[PDB]
Amino acid sequence: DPEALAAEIGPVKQVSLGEQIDAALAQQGEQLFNTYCTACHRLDERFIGPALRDVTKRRGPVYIMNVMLNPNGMIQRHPVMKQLVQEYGTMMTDMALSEEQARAILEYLRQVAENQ
Ligand code: HEC
């Protein structure tokens, strides 16, 4: 169970989502994605790392939060991230992100999956 494994690696164990996307939180997330993530990721194609538009359809939220917050631990202990390092070659590394920043980015990722 890859989401169970992500929760065991940490740091995040659980997330709170409302019934709908919080649009202001998603906008904050967009800005933070530009700042932290666009250097290596696109929404609709591979780049330095994988395409992200549908990551919330493919992966659980605790996985996505812990890749952002603890990419080194995820690469060391989570089989999906380890396979992606074999595929992509370069590594995602610590960005000194806080949980609230990562939760905003996750909100943005939920939004772009809806935008299609
Ligand atoms: C280049 C230096 C990176 C930065 C900046 C960010 N990511 Fe990344 N990410 C990168 C690669 C090369 C990979 C594959 C694994 C590896 O380390 O080689 C990834 C992977 C992800 C994943 C997993 C995707 C999956 O299909 O499971 C996610 C969810 C992810 N990256 C998210 C993400 C976000 C939100 C970023 C900004 C906070 C971010 N990454 C930065 C390379 C790079």
JSON list of C-alpha atoms and ligand atoms in Angstrom, two decimals:
[
{"chain": "A", "resi": 1, "resn": "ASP", "atom": "CA", "xyz": [0.00, 0.00, 0.00]},
{"chain": "A", "resi": 2, "resn": "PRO", "atom": "CA", "xyz": [2.05, 2.95, -1.23]},
{"chain": "A", "resi": 3, "resn": "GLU", "atom": "CA", "xyz": [0.08, 5.55, 0.71]},
{"chain": "A", "resi": 4, "resn": "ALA", "atom": "CA", "xyz": [0.44, 3.58, 3.93]},
{"chain": "A", "resi": 5, "resn": "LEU", "atom": "CA", "xyz": [4.20, 3.37, 3.29]},
{"chain": "A", "resi": 6, "resn": "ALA", "atom": "CA", "xyz": [4.41, 7.10, 2.69]},
{"chain": "A", "resi": 7, "resn": "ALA", "atom": "CA", "xyz": [2.61, 7.75, 5.99]},
{"chain": "A", "resi": 8, "resn": "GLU", "atom": "CA", "xyz": [5.10, 5.48, 7.78]},
{"chain": "A", "resi": 9, "resn": "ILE", "atom": "CA", "xyz": [8.12, 7.30, 6.25]},
{"chain": "A", "resi": 10, "resn": "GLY", "atom": "CA", "xyz": [6.79, 10.75, 7.20]},
{"chain": "A", "resi": 11, "resn": "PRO", "atom": "CA", "xyz": [6.95, 13.47, 8.20]},
{"chain": "A", "resi": 12, "resn": "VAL", "atom": "CA", "xyz": [3.26, 13.86, 7.34]},
{"chain": "A", "resi": 13, "resn": "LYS", "atom": "CA", "xyz": [0.85, 11.16, 8.51]},
{"chain": "A", "resi": 14, "resn": "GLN", "atom": "CA", "xyz": [-2.51, 12.65, 7.53]},
{"chain": "A", "resi": 15, "resn": "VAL", "atom": "CA", "xyz": [-3.95, 15.62, 5.67]},
{"chain": "A", "resi": 16, "resn": "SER", "atom": "CA", "xyz": [-7.27, 17.57, 5.94]},
{"chain": "A", "resi": 17, "resn": "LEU", "atom": "CA", "xyz": [-9.04, 18.45, 2.66]},
{"chain": "A", "resi": 18, "resn": "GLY", "atom": "CA", "xyz": [-12.35, 20.46, 2.51]},
{"chain": "A", "resi": 19, "resn": "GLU", "atom": "CA", "xyz": [-15.29, 19.34, 0.23]},
{"chain": "A", "resi": 20, "resn": "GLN", "atom": "CA", "xyz": [-14.05, 21.65, -2.36]},
{"chain": "A", "resi": 21, "resn": "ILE", "atom": "CA", "xyz": [-10.83, 23.23, -3.28]},
{"chain": "A", "resi": 22, "resn": "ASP", "atom": "CA", "xyz": [-10.00, 26.38, -1.26]},
{"chain": "A", "resi": 23, "resn": "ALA", "atom": "CA", "xyz": [-9.31, 28.74, -4.17]},
{"chain": "A", "resi": 24, "resn": "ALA", "atom": "CA", "xyz": [-7.15, 31.18, -2.20]},
{"chain": "A", "resi": 25, "resn": "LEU", "atom": "CA", "xyz": [-5.01, 28.25, -0.93]},
{"chain": "A", "resi": 26, "resn": "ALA", "atom": "CA", "xyz": [-4.67, 26.96, -4.48]},
{"chain": "A", "resi": 27, "resn": "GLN", "atom": "CA", "xyz": [-3.54, 30.41, -5.69]},
{"chain": "A", "resi": 28, "resn": "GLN", "atom": "CA", "xyz": [-0.87, 30.51, -2.95]},
{"chain": "A", "resi": 29, "resn": "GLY", "atom": "CA", "xyz": [0.10, 27.03, -4.16]},
{"chain": "A", "resi": 30, "resn": "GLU", "atom": "CA", "xyz": [0.44, 28.22, -7.74]},
{"chain": "A", "resi": 31, "resn": "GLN", "atom": "CA", "xyz": [2.87, 30.94, -6.70]},
{"chain": "A", "resi": 32, "resn": "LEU", "atom": "CA", "xyz": [4.87, 28.48, -4.61]},
{"chain": "A", "resi": 33, "resn": "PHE", "atom": "CA", "xyz": [4.95, 25.93, -7.43]},
{"chain": "A", "resi": 34, "resn": "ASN", "atom": "CA", "xyz": [6.40, 28.56, -9.75]},
{"chain": "A", "resi": 35, "resn": "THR", "atom": "CA", "xyz": [9.02, 29.39, -7.13]},
{"chain": "A", "resi": 36, "resn": "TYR", "atom": "CA", "xyz": [10.03, 25.88, -6.04]},
{"chain": "A", "resi": 37, "resn": "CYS", "atom": "CA", "xyz": [8.94, 23.37, -8.67]},
{"chain": "A", "resi": 38, "resn": "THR", "atom": "CA", "xyz": [8.79, 24.81, -12.22]},
{"chain": "A", "resi": 39, "resn": "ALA", "atom": "CA", "xyz": [12.58, 24.63, -12.54]},
{"chain": "A", "resi": 40, "resn": "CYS", "atom": "CA", "xyz": [12.21, 20.86, -12.93]},
{"chain": "A", "resi": 41, "resn": "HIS", "atom": "CA", "xyz": [8.54, 19.99, -13.56]},
{"chain": "A", "resi": 42, "resn": "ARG", "atom": "CA", "xyz": [5.86, 20.75, -16.18]},
{"chain": "A", "resi": 43, "resn": "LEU", "atom": "CA", "xyz": [2.20, 19.89, -15.83]},
{"chain": "A", "resi": 44, "resn": "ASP", "atom": "CA", "xyz": [1.69, 18.11, -19.18]},
{"chain": "A", "resi": 45, "resn": "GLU", "atom": "CA", "xyz": [5.03, 16.65, -20.15]},
{"chain": "A", "resi": 46, "resn": "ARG", "atom": "CA", "xyz": [8.23, 15.19, -18.81]},
{"chain": "A", "resi": 47, "resn": "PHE", "atom": "CA", "xyz": [11.06, 17.60, -18.11]},
{"chain": "A", "resi": 48, "resn": "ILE", "atom": "CA", "xyz": [13.83, 17.14, -15.50]},
{"chain": "A", "resi": 49, "resn": "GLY", "atom": "CA", "xyz": [11.24, 15.31, -13.47]},
{"chain": "A", "resi": 50, "resn": "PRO", "atom": "CA", "xyz": [7.88, 13.72, -14.34]},
{"chain": "A", "resi": 51, "resn": "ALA", "atom": "CA", "xyz": [4.73, 15.54, -15.47]},
{"chain": "A", "resi": 52, "resn": "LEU", "atom": "CA", "xyz": [2.55, 16.55, -12.55]},
{"chain": "A", "resi": 53, "resn": "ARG", "atom": "CA", "xyz": [-0.94, 17.54, -13.70]},
{"chain": "A", "resi": 54, "resn": "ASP", "atom": "CA", "xyz": [-2.42, 14.18, -12.80]},
{"chain": "A", "resi": 55, "resn": "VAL", "atom": "CA", "xyz": [-0.23, 13.36, -9.76]},
{"chain": "A", "resi": 56, "resn": "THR", "atom": "CA", "xyz": [-3.21, 13.69, -7.38]},
{"chain": "A", "resi": 57, "resn": "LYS", "atom": "CA", "xyz": [-5.09, 11.12, -9.54]},
{"chain": "A", "resi": 58, "resn": "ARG", "atom": "CA", "xyz": [-2.19, 8.66, -9.43]},
{"chain": "A", "resi": 59, "resn": "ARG", "atom": "CA", "xyz": [-0.86, 9.15, -5.89]},
{"chain": "A", "resi": 60, "resn": "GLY", "atom": "CA", "xyz": [-2.28, 9.87, -2.46]},
{"chain": "A", "resi": 61, "resn": "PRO", "atom": "CA", "xyz": [-1.86, 13.19, -0.70]},
{"chain": "A", "resi": 62, "resn": "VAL", "atom": "CA", "xyz": [0.43, 11.93, 2.06]},
{"chain": "A", "resi": 63, "resn": "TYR", "atom": "CA", "xyz": [2.85, 10.60, -0.56]},
{"chain": "A", "resi": 64, "resn": "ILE", "atom": "CA", "xyz": [2.83, 13.89, -2.41]},
{"chain": "A", "resi": 65, "resn": "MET", "atom": "CA", "xyz": [3.38, 15.94, 0.79]},
{"chain": "A", "resi": 66, "resn": "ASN", "atom": "CA", "xyz": [6.29, 13.76, 1.92]},
{"chain": "A", "resi": 67, "resn": "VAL", "atom": "CA", "xyz": [8.02, 13.84, -1.50]},
{"chain": "A", "resi": 68, "resn": "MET", "atom": "CA", "xyz": [7.99, 17.66, -1.14]},
{"chain": "A", "resi": 69, "resn": "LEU", "atom": "CA", "xyz": [8.99, 17.78, 2.52]},
{"chain": "A", "resi": 70, "resn": "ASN", "atom": "CA", "xyz": [11.32, 14.73, 2.69]},
{"chain": "A", "resi": 71, "resn": "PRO", "atom": "CA", "xyz": [12.42, 13.81, -0.81]},
{"chain": "A", "resi": 72, "resn": "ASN", "atom": "CA", "xyz": [15.65, 12.14, 0.49]},
{"chain": "A", "resi": 73, "resn": "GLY", "atom": "CA", "xyz": [13.75, 9.88, 2.84]},
{"chain": "A", "resi": 74, "resn": "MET", "atom": "CA", "xyz": [11.22, 9.06, 0.14]},
{"chain": "A", "resi": 75, "resn": "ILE", "atom": "CA", "xyz": [14.00, 8.21, -2.30]},
{"chain": "A", "resi": 76, "resn": "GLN", "atom": "CA", "xyz": [15.65, 6.01, 0.34]},
{"chain": "A", "resi": 77, "resn": "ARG", "atom": "CA", "xyz": [12.57, 4.17, 1.51]},
{"chain": "A", "resi": 78, "resn": "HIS", "atom": "CA", "xyz": [9.64, 4.39, -0.97]},
{"chain": "A", "resi": 79, "resn": "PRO", "atom": "CA", "xyz": [9.70, 2.04, -3.99]},
{"chain": "A", "resi": 80, "resn": "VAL", "atom": "CA", "xyz": [7.88, 4.40, -6.32]},
{"chain": "A", "resi": 81, "resn": "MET", "atom": "CA", "xyz": [10.38, 7.24, -5.76]},
{"chain": "A", "resi": 82, "resn": "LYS", "atom": "CA", "xyz": [13.30, 4.83, -6.01]},
{"chain": "A", "resi": 83, "resn": "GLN", "atom": "CA", "xyz": [12.05, 3.66, -9.45]},
{"chain": "A", "resi": 84, "resn": "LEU", "atom": "CA", "xyz": [11.65, 7.26, -10.59]},
{"chain": "A", "resi": 85, "resn": "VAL", "atom": "CA", "xyz": [15.25, 8.04, -9.64]},
{"chain": "A", "resi": 86, "resn": "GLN", "atom": "CA", "xyz": [16.33, 5.09, -11.82]},
{"chain": "A", "resi": 87, "resn": "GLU", "atom": "CA", "xyz": [14.24, 6.55, -14.66]},
{"chain": "A", "resi": 88, "resn": "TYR", "atom": "CA", "xyz": [15.09, 10.24, -14.34]},
{"chain": "A", "resi": 89, "resn": "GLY", "atom": "CA", "xyz": [18.64, 10.06, -13.03]},
{"chain": "A", "resi": 90, "resn": "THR", "atom": "CA", "xyz": [18.78, 13.31, -11.15]},
{"chain": "A", "resi": 91, "resn": "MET", "atom": "CA", "xyz": [17.41, 13.63, -7.61]},
{"chain": "A", "resi": 92, "resn": "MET", "atom": "CA", "xyz": [14.86, 15.86, -5.98]},
{"chain": "A", "resi": 93, "resn": "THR", "atom": "CA", "xyz": [16.45, 17.43, -2.86]},
{"chain": "A", "resi": 94, "resn": "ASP", "atom": "CA", "xyz": [15.49, 19.27, 0.27]},
{"chain": "A", "resi": 95, "resn": "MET", "atom": "CA", "xyz": [14.08, 22.76, -0.36]},
{"chain": "A", "resi": 96, "resn": "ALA", "atom": "CA", "xyz": [13.52, 23.78, 3.26]},
{"chain": "A", "resi": 97, "resn": "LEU", "atom": "CA", "xyz": [9.76, 23.73, 2.74]},
{"chain": "A", "resi": 98, "resn": "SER", "atom": "CA", "xyz": [7.27, 23.95, 5.62]},
{"chain": "A", "resi": 99, "resn": "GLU", "atom": "CA", "xyz": [4.17, 21.80, 5.92]},
{"chain": "A", "resi": 100, "resn": "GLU", "atom": "CA", "xyz": [1.89, 24.82, 5.17]},
{"chain": "A", "resi": 101, "resn": "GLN", "atom": "CA", "xyz": [3.78, 25.60, 1.96]},
{"chain": "A", "resi": 102, "resn": "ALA", "atom": "CA", "xyz": [3.55, 21.97, 0.89]},
{"chain": "A", "resi": 103, "resn": "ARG", "atom": "CA", "xyz": [-0.19, 21.85, 1.75]},
{"chain": "A", "resi": 104, "resn": "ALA", "atom": "CA", "xyz": [-0.79, 24.93, -0.47]},
{"chain": "A", "resi": 105, "resn": "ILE", "atom": "CA", "xyz": [1.11, 23.32, -3.34]},
{"chain": "A", "resi": 106, "resn": "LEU", "atom": "CA", "xyz": [-1.02, 20.18, -2.87]},
{"chain": "A", "resi": 107, "resn": "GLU", "atom": "CA", "xyz": [-4.14, 22.35, -3.18]},
{"chain": "A", "resi": 108, "resn": "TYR", "atom": "CA", "xyz": [-2.78, 23.77, -6.44]},
{"chain": "A", "resi": 109, "resn": "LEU", "atom": "CA", "xyz": [-2.12, 20.24, -7.71]},
{"chain": "A", "resi": 110, "resn": "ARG", "atom": "CA", "xyz": [-5.77, 19.26, -6.91]},
{"chain": "A", "resi": 111, "resn": "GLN", "atom": "CA", "xyz": [-6.85, 22.30, -8.91]},
{"chain": "A", "resi": 112, "resn": "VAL", "atom": "CA", "xyz": [-4.80, 21.63, -12.03]},
{"chain": "A", "resi": 113, "resn": "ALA", "atom": "CA", "xyz": [-6.12, 18.03, -12.08]},
{"chain": "A", "resi": 114, "resn": "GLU", "atom": "CA", "xyz": [-9.62, 19.57, -12.34]},
{"chain": "A", "resi": 115, "resn": "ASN", "atom": "CA", "xyz": [-8.62, 22.18, -14.94]},
{"chain": "A", "resi": 116, "resn": "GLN", "atom": "CA", "xyz": [-7.67, 19.50, -17.45]},
{"chain": "B", "resi": 1, "resn": "HEC", "atom": "C1", "xyz": [14.68, 19.34, -9.79]},
{"chain": "B", "resi": 1, "resn": "HEC", "atom": "C2", "xyz": [15.81, 19.80, -9.06]},
{"chain": "B", "resi": 1, "resn": "HEC", "atom": "C3", "xyz": [13.41, 19.14, -8.90]},
{"chain": "B", "resi": 1, "resn": "HEC", "atom": "C4", "xyz": [12.75, 20.06, -8.18]},
{"chain": "B", "resi": 1, "resn": "HEC", "atom": "C5", "xyz": [13.04, 21.54, -8.01]},
{"chain": "B", "resi": 1, "resn": "HEC", "atom": "C6", "xyz": [11.50, 19.45, -7.75]},
{"chain": "B", "resi": 1, "resn": "HEC", "atom": "N1", "xyz": [11.40, 18.15, -8.21]},
{"chain": "B", "resi": 1, "resn": "HEC", "atom": "FE1", "xyz": [9.91, 16.84, -7.95]},
{"chain": "B", "resi": 1, "resn": "HEC", "atom": "N2", "xyz": [10.95, 15.41, -8.88]},
{"chain": "B", "resi": 1, "resn": "HEC", "atom": "C7", "xyz": [12.16, 15.59, -9.55]},
{"chain": "B", "resi": 1, "resn": "HEC", "atom": "C8", "xyz": [12.58, 14.32, -10.13]},
{"chain": "B", "resi": 1, "resn": "HEC", "atom": "C9", "xyz": [13.90, 14.20, -10.94]},
{"chain": "B", "resi": 1, "resn": "HEC", "atom": "C10", "xyz": [11.70, 13.40, -9.72]},
{"chain": "B", "resi": 1, "resn": "HEC", "atom": "C11", "xyz": [11.71, 11.87, -9.92]},
{"chain": "B", "resi": 1, "resn": "HEC", "atom": "C12", "xyz": [12.38, 11.20, -8.69]},
{"chain": "B", "resi": 1, "resn": "HEC", "atom": "C13", "xyz": [13.82, 11.65, -8.59]},
{"chain": "B", "resi": 1, "resn": "HEC", "atom": "O1", "xyz": [14.20, 12.28, -7.56]},
{"chain": "B", "resi": 1, "resn": "HEC", "atom": "O2", "xyz": [14.56, 11.36, -9.61]},
{"chain": "B", "resi": 1, "resn": "HEC", "atom": "C14", "xyz": [10.64, 14.10, -9.01]},
{"chain": "B", "resi": 1, "resn": "HEC", "atom": "C15", "xyz": [9.50, 13.50, -8.53]},
{"chain": "B", "resi": 1, "resn": "HEC", "atom": "C16", "xyz": [8.43, 14.17, -7.96]},
{"chain": "B", "resi": 1, "resn": "HEC", "atom": "C17", "xyz": [7.19, 13.60, -7.50]},
{"chain": "B", "resi": 1, "resn": "HEC", "atom": "C18", "xyz": [6.73, 12.13, -7.68]},
{"chain": "B", "resi": 1, "resn": "HEC", "atom": "C19", "xyz": [5.93, 11.90, -8.97]},
{"chain": "B", "resi": 1, "resn": "HEC", "atom": "C20", "xyz": [5.29, 10.54, -9.04]},
{"chain": "B", "resi": 1, "resn": "HEC", "atom": "O3", "xyz": [4.82, 10.17, -10.17]},
{"chain": "B", "resi": 1, "resn": "HEC", "atom": "O4", "xyz": [5.19, 9.85, -7.99]},
{"chain": "B", "resi": 1, "resn": "HEC", "atom": "C21", "xyz": [6.40, 14.58, -7.04]},
{"chain": "B", "resi": 1, "resn": "HEC", "atom": "C22", "xyz": [4.97, 14.49, -6.47]},
{"chain": "B", "resi": 1, "resn": "HEC", "atom": "C23", "xyz": [7.20, 15.80, -7.15]},
{"chain": "B", "resi": 1, "resn": "HEC", "atom": "N3", "xyz": [8.42, 15.54, -7.73]},
{"chain": "B", "resi": 1, "resn": "HEC", "atom": "C24", "xyz": [6.72, 17.05, -6.76]},
{"chain": "B", "resi": 1, "resn": "HEC", "atom": "C25", "xyz": [7.49, 18.22, -6.84]},
{"chain": "B", "resi": 1, "resn": "HEC", "atom": "C26", "xyz": [7.03, 19.49, -6.33]},
{"chain": "B", "resi": 1, "resn": "HEC", "atom": "C27", "xyz": [5.56, 19.75, -5.91]},
{"chain": "B", "resi": 1, "resn": "HEC", "atom": "C28", "xyz": [8.09, 20.36, -6.32]},
{"chain": "B", "resi": 1, "resn": "HEC", "atom": "C29", "xyz": [8.15, 21.77, -5.71]},
{"chain": "B", "resi": 1, "resn": "HEC", "atom": "C30", "xyz": [7.82, 21.83, -4.34]},
{"chain": "B", "resi": 1, "resn": "HEC", "atom": "C31", "xyz": [9.21, 19.60, -6.83]},
{"chain": "B", "resi": 1, "resn": "HEC", "atom": "N4", "xyz": [8.83, 18.31, -7.14]},
{"chain": "B", "resi": 1, "resn": "HEC", "atom": "C32", "xyz": [10.49, 20.10, -7.06]},
{"chain": "B", "resi": 1, "resn": "HEC", "atom": "C33", "xyz": [12.84, 16.78, -9.64]},
{"chain": "B", "resi": 1, "resn": "HEC", "atom": "C34", "xyz": [12.56, 17.98, -8.98]}
]
